[PDB]
Every structure is written in C-alpha cells, then in structure tokens.
Amino acid sequence: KNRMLQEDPVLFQLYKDLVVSQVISAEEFWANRLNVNATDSSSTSNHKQDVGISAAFLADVRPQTDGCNGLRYNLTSDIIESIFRTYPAVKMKYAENVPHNMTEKEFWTRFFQSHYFHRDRLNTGSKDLFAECAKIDEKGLKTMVSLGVKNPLLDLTALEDKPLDEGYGISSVPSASNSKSIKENSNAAIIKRFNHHSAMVLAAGLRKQEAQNEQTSEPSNMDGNSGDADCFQPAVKRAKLQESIEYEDLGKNNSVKTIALNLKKSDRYYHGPTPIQSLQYATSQDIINSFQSIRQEMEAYTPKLTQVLSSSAASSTITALSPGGALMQGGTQQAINQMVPNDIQSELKHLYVAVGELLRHFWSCFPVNTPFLEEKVVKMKSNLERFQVTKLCPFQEKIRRQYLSTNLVSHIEEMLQTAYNKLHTWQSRRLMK
Amino acid sequence: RWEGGYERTWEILKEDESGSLKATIEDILFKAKRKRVFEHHGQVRLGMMRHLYVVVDGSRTMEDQDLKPNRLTCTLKLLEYFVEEYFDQNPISQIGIIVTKSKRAEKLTELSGNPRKHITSLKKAVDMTCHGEPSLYNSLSIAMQTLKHMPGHTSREVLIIFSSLTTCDPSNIYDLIKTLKAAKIRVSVIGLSAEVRVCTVLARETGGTYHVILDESHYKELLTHHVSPPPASSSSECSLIRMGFPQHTIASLSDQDAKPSFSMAHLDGNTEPGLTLGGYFCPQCRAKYCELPVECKICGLTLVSAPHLARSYHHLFPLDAFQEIPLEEYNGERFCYGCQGELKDQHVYVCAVCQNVFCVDCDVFVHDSLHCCPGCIHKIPAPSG
Amino acid sequence: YFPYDYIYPEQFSYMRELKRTLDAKGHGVLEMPSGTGKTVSLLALIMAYQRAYPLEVTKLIYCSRTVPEIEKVIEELRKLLNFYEKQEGEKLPFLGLALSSRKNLCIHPEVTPLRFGKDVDGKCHSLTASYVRAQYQHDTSLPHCRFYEEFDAHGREVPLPAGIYNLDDLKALGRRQGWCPYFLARYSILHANVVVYSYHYLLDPKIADLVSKELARKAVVVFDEAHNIDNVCIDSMSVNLTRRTLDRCQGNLETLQKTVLRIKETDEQRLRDEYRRLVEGLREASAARETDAHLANPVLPDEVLQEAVPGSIRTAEHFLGFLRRLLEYVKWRLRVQHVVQESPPAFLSGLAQRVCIQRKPLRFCAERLRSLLHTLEITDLADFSPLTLLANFATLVSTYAKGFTIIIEPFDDRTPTIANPILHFSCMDASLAIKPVFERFQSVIITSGTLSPLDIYPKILDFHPVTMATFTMTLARVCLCPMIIGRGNDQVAISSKFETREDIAVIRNYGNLLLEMSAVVPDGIVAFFTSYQYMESTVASWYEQGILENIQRNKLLFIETQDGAETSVALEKYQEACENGRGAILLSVARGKVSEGIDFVHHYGRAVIMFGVPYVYTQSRILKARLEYLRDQFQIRENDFLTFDAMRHAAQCVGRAIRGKTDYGLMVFADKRFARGDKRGKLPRWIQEHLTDANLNLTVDEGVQVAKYFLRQMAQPFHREDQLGLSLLSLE
Numbered sequence A: 001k002n003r004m005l006q007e008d009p010v011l012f013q014l015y016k017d018l019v020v021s022q023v024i025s026a027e028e029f030w031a032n033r034l035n036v037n038a039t040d041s042s043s044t045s046n047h048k049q050d051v052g053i054s055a056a057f058l059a060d061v062r063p064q065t066d067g068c069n070g071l072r073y074n075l076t077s078d079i080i081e082s083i084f085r086t087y088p089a090v091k092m093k094y095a096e097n098v099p100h101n102m103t104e105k106e107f108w109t110r111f112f113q114s115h116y117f118h119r120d121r122l123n124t125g126s127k128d129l130f131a132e133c134a135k136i137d138e139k140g141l142k143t144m145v146s147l148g149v150k151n152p153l154l155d156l157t158a159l160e161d162k163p164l165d166e167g168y169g170i171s172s173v174p175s176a177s178n179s180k181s182i183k184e185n186s187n188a189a190i191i192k193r194f195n196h197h198s199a200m201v202l203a204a205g206l207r208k209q210e211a212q213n214e215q216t217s218e219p220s221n222m223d224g225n226s227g228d229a230d231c232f233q234p235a236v237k238r239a240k241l242q243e244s245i246e247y248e249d250l251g252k253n254n255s256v257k258t259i260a261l262n263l264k265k266s267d268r269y270y271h272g273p274t275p276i277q278s279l280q281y282a283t284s285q286d287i288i289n290s291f292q293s294i295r296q297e298m299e300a301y302t303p304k305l306t307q308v309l310s311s312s313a314a315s316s317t318i319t320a321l322s323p324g325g326a327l328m329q330g331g332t333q334q335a336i337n338q339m340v341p342n343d344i345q346s347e348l349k350h351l352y353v354a355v356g357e358l359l360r361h362f363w364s365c366f367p368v369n370t371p372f373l374e375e376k377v378v379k380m381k382s383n384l385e386r387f388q389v390t391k392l393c394p395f396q397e398k399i400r401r402q403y404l405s406t407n408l409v410s411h412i413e414e415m416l417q418t419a420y421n422k423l424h425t426w427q428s429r430r431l432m433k
Numbered sequence B: 001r002w003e004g005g006y007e008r009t010w011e012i013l014k015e016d017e018s019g020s021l022k023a024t025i026e027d028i029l030f031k032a033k034r035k036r037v038f039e040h041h042g043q044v045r046l047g048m049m050r051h052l053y054v055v056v057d058g059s060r061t062m063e064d065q066d067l068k069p070n071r072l073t074c075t076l077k078l079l080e081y082f083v084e085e086y087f088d089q090n091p092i093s094q095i096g097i098i099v100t101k102s103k104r105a106e107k108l109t110e111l112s113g114n115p116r117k118h119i120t121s122l123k124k125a126v127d128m129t130c131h132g133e134p135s136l137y138n139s140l141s142i143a144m145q146t147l148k149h150m151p152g153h154t155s156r157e158v159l160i161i162f163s164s165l166t167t168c169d170p171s172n173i174y175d176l177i178k179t180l181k182a183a184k185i186r187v188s189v190i191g192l193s194a195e196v197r198v199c200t201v202l203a204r205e206t207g208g209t210y211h212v213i214l215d216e217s218h219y220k221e222l223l224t225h226h227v228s229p230p231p232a233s234s235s236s237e238c239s240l241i242r243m244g245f246p247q248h249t250i251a252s253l254s255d256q257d258a259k260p261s262f263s264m265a266h267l268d269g270n271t272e273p274g275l276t277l278g279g280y281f282c283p284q285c286r287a288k289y290c291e292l293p294v295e296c297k298i299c300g301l302t303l304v305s306a307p308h309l310a311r312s313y314h315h316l317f318p319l320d321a322f323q324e325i326p327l328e329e330y331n332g333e334r335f336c337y338g339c340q341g342e343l344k345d346q347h348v349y350v351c352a353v354c355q356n357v358f359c360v361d362c363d364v365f366v367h368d369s370l371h372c373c374p375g376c377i378h379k380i381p382a383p384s385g
Numbered sequence C: 001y002f003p004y005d006y007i008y009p010e011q012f013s014y015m016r017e018l019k020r021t022l023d024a025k026g027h028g029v030l031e032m033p034s035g036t037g038k039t040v041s042l043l044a045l046i047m048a049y050q051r052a053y054p055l056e057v058t059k060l061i062y063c064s065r066t067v068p069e070i071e072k073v074i075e076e077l078r079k080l081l082n083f084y085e086k087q088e089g090e091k092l093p094f095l096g097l098a099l100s101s102r103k104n105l106c107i108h109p110e111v112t113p114l115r116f117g118k119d120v121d122g123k124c125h126s127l128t129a130s131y132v133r134a135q136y137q138h139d140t141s142l143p144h145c146r147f148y149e150e151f152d153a154h155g156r157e158v159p160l161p162a163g164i165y166n167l168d169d170l171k172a173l174g175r176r177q178g179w180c181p182y183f184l185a186r187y188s189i190l191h192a193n194v195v196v197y198s199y200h201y202l203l204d205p206k207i208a209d210l211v212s213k214e215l216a217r218k219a220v221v222v223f224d225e226a227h228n229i230d231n232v233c234i235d236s237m238s239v240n241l242t243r244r245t246l247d248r249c250q251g252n253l254e255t256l257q258k259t260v261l262r263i264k265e266t267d268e269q270r271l272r273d274e275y276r277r278l279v280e281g282l283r284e285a286s287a288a289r290e291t292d293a294h295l296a297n298p299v300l301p302d303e304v305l306q307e308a309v310p311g312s313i314r315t316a317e318h319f320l321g322f323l324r325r326l327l328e329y330v331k332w333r334l335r336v337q338h339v340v341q342e343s344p345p346a347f348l349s350g351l352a353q354r355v356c357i358q359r360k361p362l363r364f365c366a367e368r369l370r371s372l373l374h375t376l377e378i379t380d381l382a383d384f385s386p387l388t389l390l391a392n393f394a395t396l397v398s399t400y401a402k403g404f405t406i407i408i409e410p411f412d413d414r415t416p417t418i419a420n421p422i423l424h425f426s427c428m429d430a431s432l433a434i435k436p437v438f439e440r441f442q443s444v445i446i447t448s449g450t451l452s453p454l455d456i457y458p459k460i461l462d463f464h465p466v467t468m469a470t471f472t473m474t475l476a477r478v479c480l481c482p483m484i485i486g487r488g489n490d491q492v493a494i495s496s497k498f499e500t501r502e503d504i505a506v507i508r509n510y511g512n513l514l515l516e517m518s519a520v521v522p523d524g525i526v527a528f529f530t531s532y533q534y535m536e537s538t539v540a541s542w543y544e545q546g547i548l549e550n551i552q553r554n555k556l557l558f559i560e561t562q563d564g565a566e567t568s569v570a571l572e573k574y575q576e577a578c579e580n581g582r583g584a585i586l587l588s589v590a591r592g593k594v595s596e597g598i599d600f601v602h603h604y605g606r607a608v609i610m611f612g613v614p615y616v617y618t619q620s621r622i623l624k625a626r627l628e629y630l631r632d633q634f635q636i637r638e639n640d641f642l643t644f645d646a647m648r649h650a651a652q653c654v655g656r657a658i659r660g661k662t663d664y665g666l667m668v669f670a671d672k673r674f675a676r677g678d679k680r681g682k683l684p685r686w687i688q689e690h691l692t693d694a695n696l697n698l699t700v701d702e703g704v705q706v707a708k709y710f711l712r713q714m715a716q717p718f719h720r721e722d723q724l725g726l727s728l729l730s731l732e
C-alpha cells in the first residue's frame, strides 16, 4: 500500500492532506478509497507478458534466447526469466545452486552453451537437466495413455503382433545406413528437444488452471454441417409489444411535459365553438374573405409604410443595443481566489467525493435494510466528523474578509448541506438497535 | 508459354463489342459490379445504453500493407469516424478503449463518452509500434473486472479489433466461455483478412457476431453493422433509475456577477481541472461544472439530457420500409413526392402505407438521414387516435 | 430412407449406383469425394437395401482399415437406427458386430494391461483351452475364466441381444452381462445381420480367418478406401524370417525334446489313441478357441488336406523333419547371404535334393507341428510363436510358389553390417488373394475416394460391370483450392531428382513456401513427408541452419516419431493445441501410418501441402518381379502404375481434411511431376472444376495471395449452399 502512495505523487498529494489537515486515517484511507482497483490497478504486475505463460512467449523463447556473449538482463523478464517460469524442477535447482554451486554470471552461458548445440554431458547440472527430460517424456508417456482415444498407437498395434511383423517395415531403410553415425544420433535428440519444446506447452498448460478433462472420446461426434441449428433466436415479440403500448401512451399522453401540455390544451379549449363550428364558419368565411385580398396586392402594395412602427421597432433594438450597469470587471480577484483554493482545496474537496459518493451509496440502499453492515452503518458515522470538521478551518481561513468570503460561501454550504442532508435523511428512516 | 499466357488474361478483357460502341459494355459491367448489401434490418428486443470495449490487436500483422500503408491506418482512421458516428447515433453509451500490445492489455481510454478524449487518444495511437503478440486474456481480464463493477442493468458488449493472428495467451480462455457466459458480457470480434476458429468458436459461444475484413468499404460496413445497438441475449434488465435531469445555469439569474468564476475548489461541481463560470447543474450533488450529458463522480448518477440521448434511439427502432417498382404510374406530374424531380432509373420508390413516390436521393435521405417517411405525416397525424 | 435435409445432391447420384450394382448383381466401383459422409452416402442406401428383401436375402459384411473409424461408422448410424425408427413406427431387430479380438479382449486384471496383443492373447488361450482344456478340473491352477463358462451356459441357451455394441460396450456387459468379445461374438455371428471389422482381419491368409460360413448365396460385402490392396495382400502373405528367430527356434528345438523325453506314455498314449484316429477318420481335435492359436489355412484355395500323416509317422521323427528342415534352412540361409536371389520354385526343387521326402511333409507340417504339441498342450504360445512361423513357411512354399515370389534380403536395411539377414516370401497375385474373396461373395463394391484411373482394377486383374466417374456439383462457392506450385524464382525441383540427400539447395525454400503457408493459413495444417529418415532429412538443415526462427513463433510443430508411442503424443497435443489460442501446424509422413483413421474436421486440420512425389523409393527389387508380372499382364506398366502408386497414396493422404461439404481444404501441390501424373491421379470430379483452371506454375510468393483470396471470401457469406428440398429432376 505504501509503494502505491509513493510512486504516485498526485494521489500522494491527495494522501497528504488527510494527514496534513488530519482529515482521515490510513486505515480509513484504504477502507473506502480503493476497494475495486485492488483487481484493476493491481492487474499490471501480475500479468507481465501474460502470466501462467503457456502459449504466448513459447513462440519466442527459442529465437530470443541469445543475442551475444552477454546480451542478457534486459528488464525483469528480458530474455531469461520465463524460461525459468515453465520448467518447475529446473527452477528449483537454480536457487539451490546459483550462485551456490558456481558464479551466477558463469551459470548463464555454460549451462546453456552445450545444451543449445547438441548434447550436454560435461557437468551434472546440465546432465540432470538432460537426464530428467527423458523421464519427463517417460512421465509424459503415461498421461497420453490415459486419454487413449483417436490415438492409432492403439490402432497400429493390432496389425503387427498378429503376423509378428512390422519389424521389417521398421528395418527397411535405404540411402547409406552403414557408416555415418552422426545425425542419426543428433536429429532424434533435436526431435526430442523440440518435442520438449512442444510439451513445454504441456509443461505450462498445467500452469493455466490445471486444464484437465482427458477425453473419454464422447461417442457422438454428430457431423452437423446441416440441420440449421441457427444459434440465436430473437424476435419473439419483445419490442413489438413495447411499440403497441408506449406509442399508445404517447398517443393518450402526447408530451405531458413543462410547456408541452399546459399551453397545448388551453388554447385548444380557446378554440371554443369549433364543434359548433361557428368560429370555423367565420374562419372559413375569413378563408373566403382574404382569399381575394392577398392576390390583388394593392392592399399588399402599401403594407410597408408605417414609420410609426419603425421607431418602436428601432427602440427595443437600441434598448437591447446597450445593456448597462452589470459589473463589467467581474473577475480580477479570481486569480488570488484561484491559487489559494486550487492549492489544497481542489484535492481536499476530492477527498470528500471519493468518500461522499459512497456516503450517498450506502444510504442509496439503507431503508431496504439489506446492505446494513456494521462496516457501513458506522462508516456513515466515521467520515461524517472526519470531513465536516476538517473543512471548518478551510472555511474559517477564508472568512478573514467579509464580501471576499460571502460570495464563495454561498456555494460551499452544499458540502455542509449534502453532509447534513445525508445525516438529516439518515434518521428519516429511524433505525432500531 | 507464359509470355502469351500473361496476355491471354489481358486480350479478351480488352476486347468487346467491336465495330462501333467499343469500351462501352465494360463500363456497364462496372455499374453491374455495384449495388451491394443494403440493410436487412427489422429487429426488436434489445439494444440500449451499450458499454463498448475497444480491444486492439497490436501485432506484427500491422506491418503488412494489404489496404493501407499500415493496417492500423486502415483501422485507426475510421475508428474516429466510428467514434463520431456512434456518438451521433448512440450517446446513451460509453466505450472502453483498451489496447493489447506486447502480450498484455492497456486500457488506454477509460469507459467514457467524451469524444475528444477518445479521438486524441487515437491521434496518440498513430505512432504505435504494435510490438509483440496479441493477448486477449489480459484484455478480457480488464473487460471482466471493469464491467464486473458495472450494474446488471447495463448493456455488456465488447468490440475487438483483432489482426487474425495467433491468440497468444494462456490461462484457459476456453474456460473464459463459462466465465463470461455467466457474466452476461457479449464479445464481438471481426477478423482482419483471415479467421481464428477459436475466436470464431468464442463468438459463436458468445452471441457476439464475428466477421472477417474483406475490404476498406467492407470494413466500414461491419462498423456500420455494429453502430446499431444490437438485440443481445434475453434477460439482461428492464429499467435503469435515477436519471438525473439537470439544469443549465446562466450565472446571471438573480445576483449579477457575484462570482468571478464558478470553479474555486469549494463549489458543488467544478469537477475537471479548468476554470468555469457556471453553465450546468445536476440534481443530486447539485453539481455545477462544464456541461456534460453523461454522468458524474459525486452524485454518481446519470446526467441525462433528454433532447439528445433520450431522442436518439427514440426514433431509431420504429422504422418501416418502402417498395420499388419500375412501372409508370406518373404520380405528380412525373414528379417526386419529396424532392420533385425525375430521372426514371426504374426505381419508383413507393411507401408501404401512405404510398408516396420517391427517388434514390429521397430514399437514401430517408434511409440514412431522415429515417422515416414524412408522407406518413399528413397521413398518420390527421386521423391519429 | 434418410434424405433428412439438403444432402448436397449426391444420394440421388448414388441411388441408382446401388440399384445398378445390387439389383443387377454388379460388382461395382465408386468414385467418392473425400468430403462425402462415407456411410451417410453409402449405408443409408445399404441399410435401405437391408430391409428390402428384394428376392429374399441381404447379408451385410463391412470392413474398413482403422478401428476408431470403425466405431465412427457405428457412431452416427445409431441415430440412423433411431431416424426412421420413429418414422416407420415401431422398431425392428438389428445387429452390427464390431468384431475386435486383437486389442479389446480381456476383463481379467492379471491379463489385460500387458501392452501387446498377440502374446497376451496367447496367455489367455493357454489359460482357457490349453491349461483348462488339459487340466480340466482343479481349483487354483485352473484359473477363473468364469464367463467363458457363462458362455457355455448361454450358448446352451438362447438370448436375443439388442443393437450394435462396441468394444467397450460389452466390457461393461463383461462386468454385468455381455460376455467375451470373441464368444459374445461367435454366438452373434450365428445370427449376425451386419459385421464391421478391419480390412486386415478378413485378409489374413496366414491364419485363415473365415468370418462367416462359406455361403455365397447372396454374400453382401461393402468396401471403403480400398486403396493399397497389394500393400495389404502381398504383405498379408509376406513372411519375414530373423536369424535371431531361428537361433531361438534352434534353442527350443531340444528344449521341446526334453518335454518329449520326460513324457513316456502319459501324453504319449494320449497321442496313440488319437493318432490312430488320425489314420482312421480325419477330424480336427478342437472346435473351440484353440484354432485361434492355430494356422487355420496358410494356403486357402486348395481342395483338402486329404493324406495327412505325411512321410512322418512319429513325433521325434517329425521333429527330425524340422531338424531336416531348419538346419538345412540355415544351410539354405547362411551361405545364401552373399547374393540376393529371386528363385521361388527353384528353391523347393533344390530343397528336394536336401529334404528327403518333400511336397507332402512340406504341406502337411503346420498342423502336425501343432497337433504333436496338442498332445502336449504345454508350451506357452509366445515361446512357440517363432516356430509356428516356420511350419507356416514351407507350407506356403509347398503350395503356391510358381506364381509367387521368394526374395532374400540380407544386406543393409537398418543393419549397417550383415548383422540381421532376412529373406521374404511374398505373393504377387492379390487377385489370388481376392479371387477366393470374390468366389465366396456375390458381387461386392469397392469405393475409393482416391481411385482416379479405373485401369488399376485390372491391376487387381478382375472383371467389372459397373465402373464410372462420380461427378458432384459445388454450389458451396468453391469446394477447395488445389494449387500446383512450380516456383520459377526458387526454381521448382520438388521431385527427388537430386534426391532428399543430394543437395540442400532444393531444401532452401521448402521452409520459405511453408512459413508463408504458416503465416497466412491459420487453424492447423497436417502435411505429409515421404519417410521417417526423409523426415529426419527434412528437419536436418532446419535446426542448424536458421529455419524455425519464425516457424515456432507463428504456429508450433508436432514431430511424429518412428515409435508410435511418442507419435500418439503430439496427437494428444494437436487436437488440443489447435482448439486453443494456437495454430500449431503438425508435421507428418504420407507413407507412414500416421495418415489413416483421423478424418480431419474444419475444427482442426484444414490444409495439406504436398512434398515431393509420394512414391516408394525404398525397398529394392520388390519392384521387379511385381513389375515384370504386370508386364506379363499388360506389358507397358513400368511408366504406368509407378505413377499411380504415388497418386493412390497421395489423395489417400492429402484428400482427407474435409468431412461434410463446406469444411474447407487447402490442398496445394508442391511438386515437380504434375504434367500428366498429378492430373491422371486427381479425381475426374476434381481435375475438372478446380485443378489448374489457369493456375499451374504458381510461384509461392504469387500463390500467397491465392489462399488469401481463397479463404477471405470463403469465410464470410455462408448460408445457402446447394439446398435440395423436393424432387425437381434437374437430371444432373
């Protein structure tokens, strides 16, 4: 927890004033601040080139195993560590013997110089490395027996003990099998070496989450290229049903909002004798009346010359052309009134909002009396005094002046109030013992 | 042999109807090459308030050109467009930009809806080496643990940009099926020019939809296919409550200029590190800061701003369709019910109900911009009841 | 009659194939695509013909070549059993007998988990019908083979079993009711209505495994993938003989004499009562499982062994006949080790100088080998197994040698010195292995998905009424991409002209054509090398020179071993290492026995790369007599089948990775010999629409984008691919 508060100076600057202004404790700091990022923010050091490494690095362990005589020790995993992170017992003997047997630096080449080429028989360190891997494949033999299905080692064996043959099918090699004895020895070990590298997945597949079912052949395997399984099945009338009732509710209640309803029906009621149609008769008469009046446009020749109605039309133009007396210089103390609260109190207030949001949260479920924990019902009580006291001296430091203070304190008292709201509302649901 | 055979390919395709009218039908086949998949929509059920997760394969597959000078250049440029057209269509949602690079996963931009932050992140994502191999397990780990703390009243979908390579990650991601099938989180990948069966099995075990990138036009199509909030699996939620209606504040209401700036480390609101003068107001914190139609960090509820986001999908579902006829019922004076013209490329577009005549430029303008026939208006609202 | 949905317009293409080959009693040859459910095609009409007692009689024998796919045959037909069962109303009786006796056998824990088959079955039969046939009554020595006695009880009785079981299904019945796979099979052969077993088990001329009664009334037998019949039949009669065997046999020569010396009249007067009965009326002493430990008929197409008790009247006298044989046989071996000599009937003639009485004691020996041990009933079978080898041999040399072939192979094959010489008796007439088959049968149908030249059924040297070319359409977009490579840049030399170890400059770009195949193609690839040392030659430059440096970084690699134990390991990996976040390309050998029994699915395994001409290249002078005899049959055949032998193994191996008909397959052809040979060997349905449409000399770097163009299109837009509903003629 302490490396977290030192490597991050911004959160440390947050963590300072809970000790500096004595807001909360460290016990309270790690009780309601983090609580989620214990999985999220700690997801960096655990993964680190995908831990439980099975099939990510194993592609690249052999090409990046050597740059030079000393091209090693990059960072943490650089080019040596995940080699140790797969072989269990080889990793065991390492701390047993490095640098307990030899020099630590002399380990990294001499243990890997002769094992890299063909074969390592010069010392029992690489020899027991070499000798165990045969037992590993012997150990890996027993596991493949337990699966034993889709494995024609079974199916091949039925045809060779039966005539006592397929020993000649083994012993029928052409192409000068007489006088070399070099790569015959060599390649089968490289066959063995990369099958180790192949079973290095298997040596790390157990690290994944132990990965076992071992295949009792599941005797169905129904070749299903046909059938039309068609996995997803929506459209069993779900938003069809919403549309039938909500537009019905948008029909019977079309916009019952602020201006959306109250002015609407009030002027529809003003239309009055509209089913009586006597207003509609005069309407349709006035539809018939000014029908002809528009088109002549001699009446609509001079529907312009009213400079009587220009002056007033010029007037509220000029009235809105000059608003006056509204404190043109509204700032210019704001720089002093920025740097003093945005030195501590930006972060100080943030100390609350990391907590006070949870203070809204436990009360956001409390009358159900389910999330009623002693961890929480006194966490209601805990930070209550831990915040509403530690703001009072930041409150009392700024009441050094009067109108310099009374403007901003109109906006800080919400913090006092949202505290006391929560506290005030806490007993609106009276809790028993 | 091949010197002829290299040009047996050219010779016939060059050749056409000769005499007169040459290099003519070759242009006709190019128009006949056009007209790909239109909509094939018409869905119901789910799609509301998505919580997307951009997952980016950063690998050596990017170094192949194949559409652009980089496959990220194919990718990253249109993501910004995909961001903007999303925030166009779906503002009720938010997106987790998470980047896989060198066998890990970096949640680059958090699950949020602030477009500039997401876009400049992509503008920061330009000069990415994409060193190392993809690891989806680290990506799903962030995807779990983040969305684990999201409510079950949240739409839980993941959009993975994968470069079709080997899924280089341990720790039984096949067993992450039952992890996430139970966790009711959807995961959608599209493959870059190839296919990963395990990931194809993953999505078909998900209900997330998998595709393969064909072309840059085709790349846009599936983006556009995934713009729309899809009908995911049943039994996610019904409701989502304490949608905070805010206030705009003018800071000139009664006391004219009594506060030089409405962000001074004590005011209810003032969340982000910048000066402000009072524009906004939330109900529950009574939080006054820079205007944002999303949510907050102290009231912690949703800063809903209805005309924007409670309007966007509010007509994105209830659509109908038109029909096409090549015939000549000459409605109008050989006109359109909309733009009022004529070319007659035998696509006389008739509504299903009001049955009004339109063109492509009136059909497209509906089916991309207007999203409804206004011929239904004057026809719906007059007998409506 | 299971059309059951769109069935990629093929059952109708095979509907009249039955009705022509069966109603008219047609022998019949079928082409089939590798992506055609090989029984869903076939058995759906065969089981339809099962109920159709079209005059009266419909047998069924079926065979294939691998016991897992044997059960895979059984596997979905159980739903096909259930399919029309609900549809036709009630359910009628049925039986399909998977008759395994090699591996699947014994429920006793003392017997079971010893690894091999034959020797442990010798322990089983030595216990049952050699210890508990000799020492009948007893308590301890007699061991608890209790459910053989339960077979005695219900073989006196009449149960009626259910449907088709498996090897393991009776084993729980072994631990409940179903008894012995052999017995619970002998009683079910009595009323069997369908038999499935190995292609090998029928074709045992050494122990003549007569499956049914010889009832050729309507003997109805079905054959799939019947490709390498010669490699069955000639190897079915091939006789290997180790010098180490003979010396072990030389050691149990006088070992058995000590058993003769210690037994004065106890087992000897047991012989004397019945060796007189051998003279009086000829009858084999045992009808039970003793014949399983016995050469039933080494040379089957003979009349009878009439004058048994050959020129041999006593047992040590008969033992001296092998002293006259073996000691002369090493005299017919050890001096002959300097020269390979191919003289099959000349040997037995020169033997007649050396063997005193011949051609009857040559043929009447292996029973009198066994029967003089049957009065003993002592010797353990694995001990006696290298001896039964020998009296099998001269028996075969006695009867069928003038049409057949003796070959002596002392020199270097896994012996750098002469440290193990060998000879072989091969037959040559797989016809004469399958002529008795055909005479015992009615008219029986081969189906081989590789057999493109129909001219090789007269390599079986037989007659055929029905032999056509199956043509199926592909509305599945494009079935596959066959891709003949022929690089121009790296200059294709893919046939071993400069052989697999003559130059590595050839080999400098098989990695290049693979890694890019590895880089593009996902989802597991199983490629085919030529042989194990070829495979050993294949990776020989791959380690020391820089090859795998990206190959392991892209996918991973699954080495297949000369030993089948470690070969089955990567297998356990490959079915797993594909289905997780890894492509993991397997690497394998065509001619090696890793190439059968799999049926790769779109799940894992969907691409195959050719590597070289898939011909024999190994065994010396097994060719020439086989060559000249077909040159004594058709006279221009050197050029001819020595193409197709590669080809018949090629798509046997290559054409495997698609099962249904959308399963994909990238079967590219890195080959130098393609001009006619690959074209003749590829299916006439498969050369036509797909092979070299305009893509022959396709350099890999250019052929890169081909599979890119292939897959990317083929991955998307699948819904409808050749949908059949009702019957609308179409008439192909």
Ligand code: SF4
Pocket (backbone or CB within 6 Å): C105, C106, C107, C108, C111, C124, C125, C128, C145, C148, C180, C181
């Ligand atoms: S007979 Fe049946 S049980 Fe007795 S040995 Fe053979 S298997 Fe084992």
Ligand SMILES: [Zn+2]
Pocket (backbone or CB within 6 Å): A360, B283, B284, B285, B286, B298, B299, B300
């Ligand atoms: Zn609030």
Ligand SMILES: [Zn+2]
Pocket (backbone or CB within 6 Å): B336, B337, B338, B339, B340, B357, B358, B359, B360, B361, B362, B363
């Ligand atoms: Zn129009």
Ligand SMILES: [Zn+2]
Pocket (backbone or CB within 6 Å): B351, B354, B355, B356, B373, B374, B375, B376, B377
């Ligand atoms: Zn309309």
